[PDB]
Amino acid sequence: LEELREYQRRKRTEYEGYLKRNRLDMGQWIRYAQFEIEQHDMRRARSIFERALLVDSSFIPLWIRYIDAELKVKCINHARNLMNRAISTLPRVDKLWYKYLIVEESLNNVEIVRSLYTKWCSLEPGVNAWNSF
RNA sequence: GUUCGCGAAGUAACCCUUCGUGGACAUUUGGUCAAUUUGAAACAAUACAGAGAUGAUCAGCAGUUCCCCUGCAUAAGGAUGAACCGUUUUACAAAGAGAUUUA
Ligand SMILES: [Mg+2]
Ligand SMILES: [Mg+2]
């Protein structure tokens, strides 16, 4: 376990030291947020992504990946509540809607998307958006 | 304890002493804290590692950090004060070609 313990500890010194110095460079956050996922600890990883939304919330690769780590282990109402916060923050975006729509397809629930497209049409988005509805 | 008044005692031209009493005067200090080993000074010495760039030797001045130290300091010094120079794979598709493959 010390063959493990000191591994995890030494990594969390190196990653934080760099992020300590560079608030930006999201490339590091996602990497380091991925490290804590592969240790099967969701609490730490969620903190990291939540810590990395403060730095920039306009960076969609970060938003998208933090949907993955929720969906991969199948924590539903988190990746569900998250999408409340996700598309209310950046309501214009394209990718964020479709990744919320297409993930609702594989959940087979068409009542959701019925009300989804209600709002997403209420927002008057544009051509390619309406055509999906 | 002082003073006012009263009530008694011995002496008493009513006063001095003595006793018993009513009232007034005066009215809530200090602790965030307990006296040596177990609620946290530091330095020196010893051993190990050695003080930026670059072919090599050097002057430095800044920036960034959930590092500080000497200094009256918003001056200036402290190795250019220190620490940092590592790691990096997905908003991701469009066209075509081969093969497997089912109503
Ligand atoms: Mg310096
Ligand atoms: Mg200096």
Distance A21 CA to ligand 1 centre (A): 16
φ/ψ region of A124 (left if φ > 0, alpha if ψ in -120 to 50, else beta) reads left
Which amino acid, residue A34? Q
Q: What is the DSSP letter of A107?
A: T
Rounded Cα distance between A90 and A59, Å, is 10
Q: Please classify residue A111 by burial: count the beta carbons closer than 10 Å to its beta carbon, then call 0-12 exposed, 13-18 middle and 19+ buried.
A: exposed
CA atoms of A12 and A48, how far apart (whole Å): 11
Residues engaging strand B (CB under 7 angstroms): A 14-16, 18-23, 25, 27-28, 30-31, 60-61, 64-65, 68, 93-95, 99
Say what the resolution is, in angstroms. Answer: 3.5
d(CA A63, CA A65): 6
d(CA A68, CA A15): 21
Q: How far is the CA of A9 from the C1' of B45 (A)?
A: 35
Token output for A94: 């394209």
Our measurement of the distance from residue A44's CA atom to the centroid of its chain's CA atoms, rounded to an integer in Å, reads 14
| Spatial separation of the C-alpha atoms in residues A63 and A53, rounded to whole Å | 8
Name, in order, each residue with C-beta under 8 angstroms of A103's C-beta and a sequence gap of 6 or more.
A67, A71, A79
What size, in residues, is chain A?
133
